[PDB]
Amino acid sequence: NVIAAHKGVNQAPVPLKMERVGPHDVHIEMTAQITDIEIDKGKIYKAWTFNGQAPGPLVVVNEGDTIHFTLKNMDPVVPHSMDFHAVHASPSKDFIDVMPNKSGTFTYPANKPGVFMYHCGTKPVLQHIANGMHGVIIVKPKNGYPTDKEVDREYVLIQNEWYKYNDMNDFQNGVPSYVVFSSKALKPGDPNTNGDTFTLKEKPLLAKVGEKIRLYINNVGPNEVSSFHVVGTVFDDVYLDGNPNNHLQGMQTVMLPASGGAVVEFTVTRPGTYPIVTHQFNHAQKGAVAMLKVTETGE
Amino acid sequence: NVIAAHKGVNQAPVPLKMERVGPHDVHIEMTAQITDIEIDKGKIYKAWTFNGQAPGPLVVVNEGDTIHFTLKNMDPVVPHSMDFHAVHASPSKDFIDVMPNKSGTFTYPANKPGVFMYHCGTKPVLQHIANGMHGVIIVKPKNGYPTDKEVDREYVLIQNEWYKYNDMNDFQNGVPSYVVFSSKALKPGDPNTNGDTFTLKEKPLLAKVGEKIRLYINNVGPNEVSSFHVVGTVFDDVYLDGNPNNHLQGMQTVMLPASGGAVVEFTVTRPGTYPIVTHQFNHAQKGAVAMLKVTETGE
Amino acid sequence: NVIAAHKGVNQAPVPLKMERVGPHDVHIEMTAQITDIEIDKGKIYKAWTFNGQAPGPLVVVNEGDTIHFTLKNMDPVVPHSMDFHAVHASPSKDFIDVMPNKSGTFTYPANKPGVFMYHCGTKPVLQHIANGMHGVIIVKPKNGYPTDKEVDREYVLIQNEWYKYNDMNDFQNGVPSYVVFSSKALKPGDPNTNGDTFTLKEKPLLAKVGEKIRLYINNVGPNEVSSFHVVGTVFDDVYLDGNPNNHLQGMQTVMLPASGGAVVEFTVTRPGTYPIVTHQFNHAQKGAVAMLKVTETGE
Numbered sequence: 001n002v003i004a005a006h007k008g009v010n011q012a013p014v015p016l017k018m019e020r021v022g023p024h025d026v027h028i029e030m031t032a033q034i035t036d037i038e039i040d041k042g043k044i045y046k047a048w049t050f051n052g053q054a055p056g057p058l059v060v061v062n063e064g065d066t067i068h069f070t071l072k073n074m075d076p077v078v079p080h081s082m083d084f085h086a087v088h089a090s091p092s093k094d095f096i097d098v099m100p101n102k103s104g105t106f107t108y109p110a111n112k113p114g115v116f117m118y119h120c121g122t123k124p125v126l127q128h129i130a131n132g133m134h135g136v137i138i139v140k141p142k143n144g145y146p147t148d149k150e151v152d153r154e155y156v157l158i159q160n161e162w163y164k165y166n167d168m169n170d171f172q173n174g175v176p177s178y179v180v181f182s183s184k185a186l187k188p189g190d191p192n193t194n195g196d197t198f199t200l201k202e203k204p205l206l207a208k209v210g211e212k213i214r215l216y217i218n219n220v221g222p223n224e225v226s227s228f229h230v231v232g233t234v235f236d237d238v239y240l241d242g243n244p245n246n247h248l249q250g251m252q253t254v255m256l257p258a259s260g261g262a263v264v265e266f267t268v269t270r271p272g273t274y275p276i277v278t279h280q281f282n283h284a285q286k287g288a289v290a291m292l293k294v295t296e297t298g299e
Numbered sequence: 300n301v302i303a304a305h306k307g308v309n310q311a312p313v314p315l316k317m318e319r320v321g322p323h324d325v326h327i328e329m330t331a332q333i334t335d336i337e338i339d340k341g342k343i344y345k346a347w348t349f350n351g352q353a354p355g356p357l358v359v360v361n362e363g364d365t366i367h368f369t370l371k372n373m374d375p376v377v378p379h380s381m382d383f384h385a386v387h388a389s390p391s392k393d394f395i396d397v398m399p400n401k402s403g404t405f406t407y408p409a410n411k412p413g414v415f416m417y418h419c420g421t422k423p424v425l426q427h428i429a430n431g432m433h434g435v436i437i438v439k440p441k442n443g444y445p446t447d448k449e450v451d452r453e454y455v456l457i458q459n460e461w462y463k464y465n466d467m468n469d470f471q472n473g474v475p476s477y478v479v480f481s482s483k484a485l486k487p488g489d490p491n492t493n494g495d496t497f498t499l500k501e502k503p504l505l506a507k508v509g510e511k512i513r514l515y516i517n518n519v520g521p522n523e524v525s526s527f528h529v530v531g532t533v534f535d536d537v538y539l540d541g542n543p544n545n546h547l548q549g550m551q552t553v554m555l556p557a558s559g560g561a562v563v564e565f566t567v568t569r570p571g572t573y574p575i576v577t578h579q580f581n582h583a584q585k586g587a588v589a590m591l592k593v594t595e596t597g598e
Numbered sequence: 599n600v601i602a603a604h605k606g607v608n609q610a611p612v613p614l615k616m617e618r619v620g621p622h623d624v625h626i627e628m629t630a631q632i633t634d635i636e637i638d639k640g641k642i643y644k645a646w647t648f649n650g651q652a653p654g655p656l657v658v659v660n661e662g663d664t665i666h667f668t669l670k671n672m673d674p675v676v677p678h679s680m681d682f683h684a685v686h687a688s689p690s691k692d693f694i695d696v697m698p699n700k701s702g703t704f705t706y707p708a709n710k711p712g713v714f715m716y717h718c719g720t721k722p723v724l725q726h727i728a729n730g731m732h733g734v735i736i737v738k739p740k741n742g743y744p745t746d747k748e749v750d751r752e753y754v755l756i757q758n759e760w761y762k763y764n765d766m767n768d769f770q771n772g773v774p775s776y777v778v779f780s781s782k783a784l785k786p787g788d789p790n791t792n793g794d795t796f797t798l799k800e801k802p803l804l805a806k807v808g809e810k811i812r813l814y815i816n817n818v819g820p821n822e823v824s825s826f827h828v829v830g831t832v833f834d835d836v837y838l839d840g841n842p843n844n845h846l847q848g849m850q851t852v853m854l855p856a857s858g859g860a861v862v863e864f865t866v867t868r869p870g871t872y873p874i875v876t877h878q879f880n881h882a883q884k885g886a887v888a889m890l891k892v893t894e895t896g897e
C-alpha cells in the first residue's frame with residue numbers, strides 16, 4: 001500500500017492563504033501535499049493533506065461570499081481536487097482534478113450559513129478522505145445566531161477516523177484504528193492541531209468558570225457517525241449544520257452523520273476538566289476524547 | 300444457504316396493481332416472489348421480493364386513505380407478509396403471514412403524511428428484509444408542503460444493503476457487501492430501477508439548470524444508517540420522515556436511521572453531473588452513489 | 599478476562615434509596631456491585647452494576663432539583679463512579695472514583711428536562727459501561743409537555759448492548775453479541791427488568807385499545823446508535839432528549855445517538871401484539887425486540 005513516489009516524502013506544512021478581494025468575494029489558495037503526522041504516540045501516518053494538516057486548515061467566510069479557490073497540487077504522482085459542502089457548484093466542472101505539479105482555480109458561492117465539510121473529491125473518494133483530505137469551512141450567518149450575545153468563548157472541533165495505511169480493504173470493510181478530535185484556530189492564540197489521540201488531552205482547550213462556550217463541530221468521517229457529548233454539561237442550544245433555523249435546546253448529545261456539522265453551546269459552571277467525547281465509546285476508547293480545562297481565570 | 304425449492308426459480312416481475320375504490324379507499328395487490336436481480340456487474344442475487352423488484356414497487360396514496368392490501372405469495376415454500384410503516388394496524392392480526400400459493404387481504408388506514416418504509420414482517424424479519432423484501436410507500440399530505448410551489452422536479456430514491464446470499468450469520472454480524480441506491484417512478488417516463496451498484500451511474504437521473512429538485516428518500520437498511528448528501532448543493536428544505544412539520548433548512552447532509560425517510564429539496568445551479576451519496580464513504584465505495592445529470596434543457 | 603476477586607461474586611440486588619429533602623433537593627444513594635444477570639437464555643454475564651440491575655435503577659427528579667448523590671462501592675477491587683448526563687457538574691471533582699468498600703457523596707443540579715443517560719465514569723469508561731454500568735435519569739419538565747393531557751399510559755424503555763465478557767478487544771473492535779431492551783418502573787405495578795433478549799417478549803408491556811402511549815427511551819450504547827420504531831403505529835409526537843422544545847410529529851422511526859434519549863408518543867388502535875424494535879435489524883435479531891400487548895381492557 002506504499003506508493004513508490006511517496007517513499008521518504010514529507011512536505012513541510014504551508015500556511016493557508018486567504019484574502020478578501022471584494023465585499024462578497026474571497027480568494028483562497030491551498031495545497032495538496034504529502035505530510036507525516038503523528039496520529040497516536042509512536043504512530044506516523046504519511047497523510048494525504050491540504051496544506052500539511054489533517055484535517056486541513058480552517059476556512060471562514062461570510063454568508064454570500066463567492067470563493068475563488070486555487071489548489072496547488074504538490075503530490076508528485078496522485079491528482080487531487082476540492083469539494084466544499086458550503087458551495088453551489090457543478091461537481092463535474094468545479095470539483096475536478098488538479099494534476100501533480102499543477103494548479104487549478106474554481107469559483108463558486110457560499111450562500112448558506114453553517115459548519116460544512118470540505119474534502120478531496122478525486123476517485124476513489126474514500127481513499128482520498130481516509131488518507132487525510134478533509135476539513136471544515138464555516139460560513140458565518142449574515143444575521144448571526146439568536147444566542148450570539150450569550151456566548152463567551154468559542155472553538156472549532158473536528159472528528160475523523162484513521163485506518164490502516166492507504167489500505168482500501170480496511171477503508172471499506174474494517175473498523176477504524178483510531179478516532180480523533182482536532183481543533184482549528186478561529187482567533188490568534190487558539191490551538192491549531194491535527195487529528196490525533198492525545199494533543200487535546202495533554203493540552204486541553206481553556207475556558208473560565210461560568211462561561212457559555214460555543215463549539216463549531218463537524219464529523220468528517222470518512223465512515224462513522226458521531227454521538228457528540230460534553231461531560232458535565234448539557235447543550236443549551238444546538239443549531240444543526242450551523243443553520244440558525246435548525247434550533248434544538250437542552251440536548252445531552254448531538255447525533256452527527258458523516259460530514260454532519262453543528263453549532264453547540266453549553267455552560268461550564270464549576271472549575272475542573274471536562275471531557276469532550278463521541279459517546280460511541282469504542283471510538284472514544286480509540287482516541288476520540290478531547291479535554292476542556294475550566295479555571296477561575298480562563299488562563 | 301440455498302433453499303432446494305428456490306433452485307432455478309426466477310419468477311418474472313409482475314406489475315403492482317392499484318386502484319382507487321372510494322374517496323378515501325384504495326386497493327393494492329402485490330406478490331411475494333423469487334427473482335434474480337443483478338446487484339453488481341456479474342453478480343446475481345436470487346432475491347426475495349415484492350413483485351420481482353428489490354426494493355419493491357413504489358406505492359403512493361393520500362393522507363387519510365384506507366388501504367385494502369392483498370399479498371399473493373408465489374414463493375413455493377416460504378411464507379411472507381407485509382408491514383407498511385405508514386399505517387395504524389394490529390401487527391399480530393394485520394401483518395400476518397400468507398402461505399405459499401395463497402393470498403391474504405388486510406385493511407388499514409394511512410393517516411400520517413410522509414415517506415415510509417414497507418417490508419416483509421415474517422420471522423426472522425432480518426432475513427426477509429436482507430433478501431430484498433423492502434420498499435417505500437409515500438403518503439401525500441392533504442395540505443401539501445409549504446415549499447411545493449418552488450419544486451420543479453421530483454424523484455424517489457431508496458437506499459439498501461446487500462449481504463452474502465441468504466447468510467444469516469453475515470446478515471447479523473458482517474459488513475454489507477454492497478450498498479446501493481434505486482429510483483422508483485412517480486410519473487410516466489421516470490426511471491424505475493432496482494438496488495444495484497451501477498444503473499443510476501450509467502443512466503443518471505435528469506434535470507435542468509436552475510431547477511429546484513425534490514427527492515423523496517428512504518434508507519431501508521436492513522442494518523445501516525445513511526448520511527444522505529447531494530454533491531454540489533445544499534438542501535434548502537428538509538422534512539424529516541416527509542412530515543411537513545419536521546422542517547429543517549440549509550442542511551448539507553441528512554442523517555437517516557434504518558427505515559428513516561425524508562423529503563429533501565435543493566437547487567442545481569450549473570450544468571454538470573452531481574453525485575448523490577451516502578457520506579459514509581465505505582458504503583459509497585461499495586455502490587451507494589447515484590448521479591444527477593443537469594443540462595441546459597433537462598433532456 | 600476474569601478478575602480473580604470477582605470469581606464466584608454475586609452480590610444480591612439492593613433497592614435504590616431516594617428521598618426528597620427540600621422543595622428543590624433530593625437524596626439518592628446507589629451501590630456499585632457485581633451481579634450475575636441472565637442476558638440471554640442460558641447466558642450469565644457477571645455484570646458491573648448499579649444496585650444489581652443492568653441497566654441500573656430508574657431515577658426520576660424534577661427540573662430544578664439538586665441531587666445529593668451517594669455511591670457505595672461494594673466491588674471488592676475495582677473503583678467506580680457516577681456521571682449523570684442530567685447535571686451540571688465538574689467532572690474532575692464531582693464524577694470521581696469511589697474506592698472499594700468506600701462511599702462518596704457529590705452534589706449537583708438537574709436544571710434541564712429530559713431523558714438522560716447515567717453511567718460509571720471510571721477509566722476506561724468503555725469497560726465500565728460495557729460491563730453494565732449504565733442507566734437513565736428522567737428530569738420532569740416544570741411545565742410538562744404540550745401533549746400531556748393526551749397520554750393514557752407510559753413506560754420507560756432502555757436499549758443497551760452486551761459483548762464478550764469483560765473483553766476490551768471485543769468492546770472496541772467487535773460487533774455486539776446481544777442488543778436488548780429493558781423497562782424500568784415509573785409507577786407501582788410497572789415491570790422492572792434488566793437488559794436481556796427475552797423478558798419483554800415473554801412478558802409484554804400492557805396497554806388498552808385506543809390508548810395513547812408515552813415511552814421515555816434512551817439508547818445507552820455503549821457503541822451503537824438506535825433506529826427506534828414501534829410496529830403498527832407512527833409516533834404522533836416526539837421530543838428529542840425529552841426536552842419539550844425539540845418537538846417532531848409523525849415520525850416512523852426515531853434516530854438515537856449513543857446516550858440519546860427521547861419522549862415518544864403513539865396511539866394503538868387495534869387489539870394485538872405490537873413489536874418494539876431497533877430497525878437496525880441485525881441488532882433486532884440479536885435481541886432488541888420488546889412487545890406491547892394491547893387488549894380490550896389493558897389487563
Ligand SMILES: [Cu+2]
Nearest residue numbers: 022023024064
Ligand atoms: Cu453587498
Ligand SMILES: [Cu+2]
Nearest residue numbers: 021026027068
Ligand atoms: Cu478572483
Ligand SMILES: [Cu+2]
Nearest residue numbers: 080120122128
Ligand atoms: Cu486527493
Ligand SMILES: [Cu+2]
Nearest residue numbers: 083085119259
Ligand atoms: Cu462530500
Ligand SMILES: [Cu+2]
Nearest residue numbers: 175176224283
Ligand atoms: Cu466504529
Ligand SMILES: [Cu+2]
Nearest residue numbers: 152210211212
Ligand atoms: Cu457568560
Ligand SMILES: [Cu+2]
Nearest residue numbers: 321322323363
Ligand atoms: Cu372525504
Ligand SMILES: [Cu+2]
Nearest residue numbers: 320325326367
Ligand atoms: Cu376493498
Ligand SMILES: [Cu+2]
Nearest residue numbers: 379419421427
Ligand atoms: Cu418475506
Ligand SMILES: [Cu+2]
Nearest residue numbers: 382384418558
Ligand atoms: Cu419496520
Ligand SMILES: [Cu+2]
Nearest residue numbers: 474475523582
Ligand atoms: Cu457499514
Ligand SMILES: [Cu+2]
Nearest residue numbers: 451509510511
Ligand atoms: Cu425553479
Ligand SMILES: [Cu+2]
Nearest residue numbers: 620621622662
Ligand atoms: Cu421553589
Ligand SMILES: [Cu+2]
Nearest residue numbers: 619624625666
Ligand atoms: Cu443533602
Ligand SMILES: [Cu+2]
Nearest residue numbers: 678718720726
Ligand atoms: Cu465502574
Ligand SMILES: [Cu+2]
Nearest residue numbers: 681683717857
Ligand atoms: Cu456520558
